[PDB]
Design an enzyme around this catalytic site. Sequence first.
Site, mmCIF file in Angstrom:
data_model
loop_
_atom_site.group_PDB
_atom_site.id
_atom_site.type_symbol
_atom_site.label_atom_id
_atom_site.label_comp_id
_atom_site.label_asym_id
_atom_site.label_seq_id
_atom_site.Cartn_x
_atom_site.Cartn_y
_atom_site.Cartn_z
ATOM 1 N N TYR A 38 17.853 42.982 -44.912
ATOM 2 C CA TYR A 38 16.776 43.176 -45.658
ATOM 3 C C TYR A 38 15.654 43.568 -45.183
ATOM 4 O O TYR A 38 15.271 43.780 -43.699
ATOM 5 C CB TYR A 38 16.544 41.859 -46.454
ATOM 6 C CG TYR A 38 17.224 41.367 -47.186
ATOM 7 C CD1 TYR A 38 16.877 42.279 -48.395
ATOM 8 C CD2 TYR A 38 17.830 40.310 -47.478
ATOM 9 C CE1 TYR A 38 18.306 41.553 -49.530
ATOM 10 C CE2 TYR A 38 18.591 39.630 -47.712
ATOM 11 C CZ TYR A 38 18.961 40.563 -49.545
ATOM 12 O OH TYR A 38 19.896 40.033 -50.068
ATOM 13 N N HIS A 40 16.801 46.435 -47.814
ATOM 14 C CA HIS A 40 17.334 47.429 -48.154
ATOM 15 C C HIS A 40 16.688 48.468 -49.208
ATOM 16 O O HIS A 40 16.898 47.657 -50.179
ATOM 17 C CB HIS A 40 18.752 46.722 -47.729
ATOM 18 C CG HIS A 40 19.448 46.429 -48.967
ATOM 19 N ND1 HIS A 40 19.376 45.995 -49.810
ATOM 20 C CD2 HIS A 40 19.543 44.575 -48.617
ATOM 21 C CE1 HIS A 40 20.070 45.493 -50.546
ATOM 22 N NE2 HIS A 40 19.859 44.487 -49.563
ATOM 23 N N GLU A 58 14.615 45.875 -51.784
ATOM 24 C CA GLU A 58 14.376 44.904 -52.186
ATOM 25 C C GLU A 58 14.240 43.523 -51.088
ATOM 26 O O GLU A 58 14.876 44.282 -49.688
ATOM 27 C CB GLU A 58 15.902 44.329 -53.260
ATOM 28 C CG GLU A 58 16.959 44.274 -52.880
ATOM 29 C CD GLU A 58 18.051 43.740 -53.003
ATOM 30 O OE1 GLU A 58 18.088 42.089 -53.569
ATOM 31 O OE2 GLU A 58 18.972 44.007 -53.025
ATOM 32 N N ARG A 77 12.919 37.903 -55.032
ATOM 33 C CA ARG A 77 12.882 39.203 -54.527
ATOM 34 C C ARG A 77 11.729 39.803 -54.849
ATOM 35 O O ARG A 77 11.886 40.304 -56.065
ATOM 36 C CB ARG A 77 14.602 40.543 -54.659
ATOM 37 C CG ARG A 77 15.743 39.650 -53.798
ATOM 38 C CD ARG A 77 15.753 39.413 -52.818
ATOM 39 N NE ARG A 77 17.377 39.167 -52.649
ATOM 40 C CZ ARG A 77 16.837 37.867 -52.291
ATOM 41 N NH1 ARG A 77 16.601 37.156 -52.648
ATOM 42 N NH2 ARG A 77 18.506 37.520 -51.699
ATOM 43 N N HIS A 92 18.035 36.149 -58.097
ATOM 44 C CA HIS A 92 19.366 35.477 -59.244
ATOM 45 C C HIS A 92 19.343 34.256 -60.315
ATOM 46 O O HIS A 92 21.132 34.234 -60.585
ATOM 47 C CB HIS A 92 20.043 35.465 -57.418
ATOM 48 C CG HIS A 92 20.605 36.462 -56.898
ATOM 49 N ND1 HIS A 92 21.442 37.763 -57.365
ATOM 50 C CD2 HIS A 92 20.578 36.599 -55.608
ATOM 51 C CE1 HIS A 92 21.344 38.562 -56.865
ATOM 52 N NE2 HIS A 92 20.686 38.140 -55.728
ATOM 53 N N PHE A 100 21.108 40.401 -61.469
ATOM 54 C CA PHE A 100 19.350 40.317 -60.984
ATOM 55 C C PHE A 100 19.135 39.849 -62.726
ATOM 56 O O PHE A 100 19.440 40.797 -63.214
ATOM 57 C CB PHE A 100 18.961 41.543 -60.181
ATOM 58 C CG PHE A 100 18.507 41.147 -58.770
ATOM 59 C CD1 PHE A 100 18.220 39.684 -58.144
ATOM 60 C CD2 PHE A 100 19.473 41.739 -58.117
ATOM 61 C CE1 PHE A 100 17.993 39.960 -56.706
ATOM 62 C CE2 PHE A 100 19.834 41.678 -57.029
ATOM 63 C CZ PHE A 100 19.444 40.536 -55.791
HETATM 64 N N1 2GP Z 1 23.015 43.475 -58.184
HETATM 65 C C1 2GP Z 1 22.299 44.039 -57.200
HETATM 66 N N2 2GP Z 1 22.915 44.761 -56.338
HETATM 67 C C2 2GP Z 1 22.496 45.667 -55.146
HETATM 68 C C3 2GP Z 1 21.799 46.062 -56.548
HETATM 69 N N3 2GP Z 1 21.312 47.287 -55.439
HETATM 70 C C4 2GP Z 1 22.058 46.901 -54.410
HETATM 71 N N4 2GP Z 1 22.675 45.909 -53.776
HETATM 72 C C5 2GP Z 1 23.527 45.238 -52.936
HETATM 73 O O1 2GP Z 1 24.940 46.125 -53.966
HETATM 74 C C6 2GP Z 1 25.884 44.242 -53.400
HETATM 75 C C7 2GP Z 1 26.755 43.685 -54.630
HETATM 76 O O2 2GP Z 1 25.602 43.650 -55.947
HETATM 77 C C8 2GP Z 1 25.064 43.788 -52.917
HETATM 78 O O3 2GP Z 1 25.149 44.041 -51.300
HETATM 79 C C9 2GP Z 1 23.745 44.425 -53.113
HETATM 80 O O4 2GP Z 1 22.676 43.581 -52.390
HETATM 81 P P1 2GP Z 1 21.834 42.302 -52.204
HETATM 82 O O5 2GP Z 1 23.484 41.671 -52.802
HETATM 83 O O6 2GP Z 1 21.558 41.929 -50.516
HETATM 84 O O7 2GP Z 1 20.849 42.865 -53.153
HETATM 85 C C10 2GP Z 1 20.960 46.132 -56.906
HETATM 86 O O8 2GP Z 1 20.134 47.081 -58.260
HETATM 87 N N5 2GP Z 1 21.531 45.382 -57.915
#
Ligand code: 2GP
EC number: 4.6.1.24
Length: 104
Positions: A38, A40, A58, A77, A92, A100
């Site tokens: 993060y 990212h 995020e 986040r 979450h 989310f």
């Molecule tokens: N749920 C979700 N995951 C995201 C999004 N953009 C990137 N991701 C990333 O895509 C993967 C599947 O959800 C995870 O590695 C997640 O990162 P984070 O787990 O850090 O949120 C988004 O908009 N929603």
Amino acid sequence: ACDYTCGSACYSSSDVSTAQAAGYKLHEDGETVGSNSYPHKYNNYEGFDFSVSSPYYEWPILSSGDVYSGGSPGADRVVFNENNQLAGVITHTGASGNNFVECT
Ligand SMILES: Nc1nc2c(ncn2[C@@H]2O[C@H](CO)[C@@H](O)[C@H]2OP(=O)(O)O)c(=O)[nH]1
């Protein structure tokens, strides 16, 4: 006081602002912390209707009031863009899988 409600966590405008400033700063310097690197890119797979333009990023906001430093990110986040505008506060908590829901 309770501007953002993420499940049971309560965040004020100041809490969000402080977290966002920290996350934007690392982004600006090209640095990341934590096992999930993060801040990212947040692709908005959920399709939230943000009022600010992409790209989004995020960054964890901790209920304890501490600024994230690579440890356990938790469920919440803050989402910001390249202009350091707040897109929204998400969590979450109350969602299935790695999805989310928006904080209210
Ligand atoms: N749920 C979700 N995951 C995201 C999004 N953009 C990137 N991701 C990333 O895509 C993967 C599947 O959800 C995870 O590695 C997640 O990162 P984070 O787990 O850090 O949120 C988004 O908009 N929603």
